[PDB]
């Protein structure tokens with residue numbers, strides 16, 4: 001297949017804006033397909049010493065082959081810019097719906113938590129750690145299944161993710177692992193049910209204090225079995241988090257009672273519960 005050029009597309013609105021990149025909606029002219037095209041300015045990548053990160057992002061995505069991840073269809077470049085042609089998830093970030101519906105009911109929480117768990121199982125199976133897992137990075141496709149994106153900061157088996165989601169070992173050891181993603185998962189479940197991330201404060205530094213102290217609370221309107229799972233994820237000792245290999249992996253995680261009624265085999269063929 002011949003290399004694609006920007007002229008092959010009618011570019012539209014900006015879908016997303018990062019520190020080092022912008023994502024734009026593009027309809028390919030010959031096929032009429034829409035793609036989310038990530039555009040990186042080379043000069044900028046270089047002056048900020050991000051080449052390894054862009055390289056790492058491209059390499060990971062090429063390796064991923066699973067419905068719960070944003071797919072990479074193509075890349076090309078002109079003299080100033082890199083272009084990554086990516087899945088366009090029509091319903092945008094999970095964060096939106098949290099902010100929109102306020103907080104998920106038990107059924108919706110269970111469904112989307114389970115899809116996220118299944119995605120982590122796959123990713124961790126490939127020896128890849130995301131390291132910046134959070135609702136903004138978890139997108140929803142036209143059928144409201146998740147697609148996890150944003151792999152520039154993954155590690156394949158230094159970097160710190162987003163404050164509310166970083167694990168304690170990041171703040172004390174500076175060396176993460178598969179378990180750091182499970183911590184972030186704990187935070188996301190809590191936020192799904194509570195409407196808000198568990199650790200939060202006036203500024204980043206206060207946030208980090210609450211984390212290493214495990215200073216956080218459960219609302220009373222909090223699904224109990226969901227509460228019990230969260231506590232088995234938000235654990236200072238990374239080797240004691242459910243789902244981590246020192247806890248014998250995703251079997252015990254998926255067998256948690258909160259997931260009692262979940263069919264793990266075909267989640268993406270299942271029909272998600274309406275979000276309201």
Ligand SMILES: CC(C1=c2cc(O)ccc2=NC1=O)c1ccc[nH]1
Nearest residue numbers: 015016036086087088089090092149
């Ligand atoms: C922000 C966004 C989308 C993305 C963001 C990325 O970082 C990577 C891929 C991607 N595909 C999208 O569709 C979006 C917003 C609204 C619809 N899609």
